[PDB]
RNA sequence: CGGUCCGGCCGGGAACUCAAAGGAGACUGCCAGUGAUAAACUGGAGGAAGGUGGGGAUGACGUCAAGUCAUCAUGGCCCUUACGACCAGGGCUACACACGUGCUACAAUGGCGCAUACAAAGAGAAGCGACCUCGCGAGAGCAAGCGGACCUCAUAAAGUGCGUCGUAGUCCGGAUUGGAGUCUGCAACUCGACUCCAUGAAGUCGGAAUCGCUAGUAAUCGUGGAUCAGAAUGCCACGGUG
């Protein structure tokens, strides 16, 4: 049976597909270090996955757009989470309860002008 | 190959003056497409606010235009030839090229 | 005048889920680079079993802990002229305090290799010599003294 | 207001277009030469370069509404002073003053 | 092995007593050196007989040290007498590299300290 | 899913980013604790998430015996054998003395050299200028695409990596003084850019004393544009790390 999922974080959207069977884990159609290798925070996807166990019995397949290698790991997070809550029913209940349906939605600060600085003033005191 | 553009300053004029090109465009017609509304081209401005001092902030800015390309299916002279020689679409501007 | 402010609770580790190690990065952090504090992180603990590490079940949190603030101090007034007092520390500060008393005191002095001097330091942190202990008997010495008339 | 700054432009700026915009092809033929350690030319490089009341340097284009030669916008044909005060009395198309 | 100064330290790098000599230094060096196809990889000081007296004779195809150094102090030597300020400038002690004077010409009276 | 300059490239799909109009969602509304069985807060619950939702545009009166006639008018004073204007040069880059703001190195947890990942947002038909070059290189030479979701500015830099350098107060920092140049303009003395080969210096985050921010904020490194003979450390947006 065919489980999918999305998710959005810090400027990136992420699309997730899982099938029962043992497999590997692709995206973009290559492995998670031939870009990704550089970063050292990357297995938060991992962190909804370690309830059906890193890819003994399932097949995990991962596209994401746009965005940095911290962003993208927070909505390929998302998209598993989104995913994992149909493979089981008991999933259902725990994927709420660890908290990773939460979004996190902020990425900038708005104008309000001047402010050279755009939030620092310049130095009060001192003469 | 005869093409059109609908330009405006504001995202409901421009939607309101599309559905008459798309009533124009089946008044003797039945074949439309799609109007796609496209990314906002936008140009931003930053200079002093007042005839009078203000030297530690200028004032800011930002012209949003609004663009749709509409497509007419079947460009008959029953359909756009009076509409090339006179337009007749306020608030907005259509712009007929070859 | 009430500060107090909001609730940041912050991310734990992506490799064993710590809270420790997911703050002690953000104290190694400088010019907000995280990448030269990840090359000091597990080297130090590494690098101390090639001297002294026995058992790791904590990784560093009882070097931590062996490591002790108590001289912390505020200022009181009703007026001009101030009034000093010392202060009883929550575990969170006593903890935030007594990591960055290690990691200064094996900047002390310029070296090679960063989880080296820190390892140095670790190797001491059984018995606490010089650094991170001789400034605070010398001015605890007015811990009472500063308690007198409240 | 010094009018004399206006009647530097309309004999620069409003006179350089068909004389000055392109021009340096009437110098260059002076480095056009068969061969190298020989001349043809001499001095006739101080004929060539001989006008002083027009020029490709010396052009300002200034404010067309108030003679300015600072803060003026070539997309309005205004100044910073005049963008708001056509704005304000709405007399200038697709410019709005807040509030996106 | 060598072609000037008197001394190298063993096979650390062979640019050392052939770089800062005067219109060679840390470019020309290694381009010299690549004459005899002594390199920055797998350093030696062994070079093979024949091999030495025609490198020697590509550091004399120009002037070395102290008689080219004579160059960099001569623009201040060739104008001095005319009272422009090249010349007075070149005749007295006084700024020549556009730096505000308002304001920290104090430093021309001396240090500092 | 069919064909393939093997290229989302072309058919084609409409799922999925995204670009975008429209509905749903949040009212202190529910419950506890305090407290005029008050009003209102604090805590809990739901959900992607509240508690001026997070944020913009925000400016009630009256303002100091306050600034601006150099943005524009205008009462008065005064000049016109000029406090004009048309030119050639100067001054605005005098320092005899009095105060500050930046930015870069002061390092090692770092630099230097040489490869490599990622954009975001502008600007572009006498313009942005690819490709390939001639040469040590600035530059010069030829010339395509492009009216810009269809080309160009433009291999983002921090970061990821491999060699290499090391406490010597730095053969680091490369200012500065020369040599060889390349261009712009009537013309580069002072007082113009940009390039190649030499040159060689102060400097261990500081002394009385003293700043800004509670979050994409403080801290830190790159990108773009307007102004445009040739040249901003000037003036404003955009993004990574955080």
């Given at each position: 049976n065919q489980y999918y999922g999305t998710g959005r974080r810090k400027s990136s959207a992420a699309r997730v597909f899982i099938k029962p069977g043992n497999g590997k884990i692709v995206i973009n159609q290559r492995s998670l270090e031939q870009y990704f290798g550089r970063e050292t925070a990357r297995m938060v996807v991992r962190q909804p996955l370690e309830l059906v166990d890193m890819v003994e019995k399932l097949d995990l397949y991962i596209t994401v757009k746009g965005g940095g290698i911290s962003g993208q790991a927070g909505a390929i997070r998302h998209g598993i989470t989104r995913a994992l809550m149909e493979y089981d029913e008991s999933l259902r209940s725990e994927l709420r309860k660890a908290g990773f349906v939460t979004r996190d939605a902020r990425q900038v600060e708005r104008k309000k002008v001047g402010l050279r600085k755009a939030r620092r003033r310049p130095q009060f005191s001192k003469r | 190959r005869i093409r059109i553009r609908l330009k405006a300053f504001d995202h409901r004029l421009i939607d309101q003056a599309t559905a008459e090109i798309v009533e124009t465009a089946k008044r003797t017609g039945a074949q439309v497409r799609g109007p796609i509304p496209l990314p906002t081209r936008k140009e931003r401005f930053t200079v002093l606010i007042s005839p009078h001092v203000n030297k530690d902030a200028r004032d800011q800015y930002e012209i949003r235009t609004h663009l749709r390309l509409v497509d007419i299916v079947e460009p008959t002279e029953k359909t756009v030839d009076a509409l090339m020689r006179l337009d007749?679409?306020?608030?907005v501007d259509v712009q007929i090229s070859l | 005048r009430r500060r107090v402010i909001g609730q940041r609770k912050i991310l734990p580790d992506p490799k064993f889920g710590s809270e420790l190690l997911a703050k002690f990065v953000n104290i190694l952090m400088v010019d907000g680079k995280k990448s030269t504090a990840e090359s000091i992180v597990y080297s130090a603990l590494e690098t101390l079993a090639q001297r002294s590490g026995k058992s790791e079940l904590e990784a560093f949190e009882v070097a931590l802990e062996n490591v002790r603030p108590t001289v912390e101090v505020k200022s009181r007034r009703v007026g001009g002229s101030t009034y000093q007092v010392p202060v009883e520390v929550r575990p969170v500060r006593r903890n935030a305090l007594a990591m960055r008393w290690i990691v200064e005191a094996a900047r002390k002095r310029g070296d090679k290799s960063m989880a080296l001097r820190l390892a140095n330091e670790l190797s001491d942190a059984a018995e606490n010599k010089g650094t991170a202990v001789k400034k605070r008997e010398d001015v605890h010495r007015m811990a009472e003294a500063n308690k007198a008339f409240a | 207001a010094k009018q004399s700054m206006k009647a530097r432009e309309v004999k620069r700026v409003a006179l350089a277009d068909k004389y000055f915009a392109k021009r340096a092809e009437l110098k260059a033929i002076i480095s056009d030469v068969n061969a190298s350690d020989e001349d043809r030319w001499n001095a006739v490089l101080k004929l060539q370069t001989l006008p002083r009341d027009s020029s490709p340097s010396r052009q300002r284009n200034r404010c067309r509404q108030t003679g300015r030669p600072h803060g003026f916008l070539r997309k309005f044909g205004l100044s910073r002073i005049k963008v708001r005060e056509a704005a304000m009395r709405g007399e200038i198309p697709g410019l709005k003053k807040a509030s996106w | 092995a060598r072609i000037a100064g008197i001394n190298i330290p063993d096979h650390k790098h062979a640019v050392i007593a052939l770089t800062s000599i005067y219109g060679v230094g840390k470019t020309r060096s290694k381009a010299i050196l690549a004459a005899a196809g002594i390199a920055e990889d797998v350093k030696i000081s062994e070079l093979s007989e024949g091999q030495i007296d025609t490198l020697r004779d590509e550091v004399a195809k120009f002037v070395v040290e102290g008689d080219l150094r004579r160059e960099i102090s001569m623009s201040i030597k060739r104008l001095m007498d005319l009272g422009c300020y090249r010349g007075l400038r070149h005749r007295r002690g006084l700024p020549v590299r556009g730096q505000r004077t308002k304001t920290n010409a104090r430093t021309r009276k001396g240090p500092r300290k």
């Open positions: - | 007749l679409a306020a608030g | - | - | -």
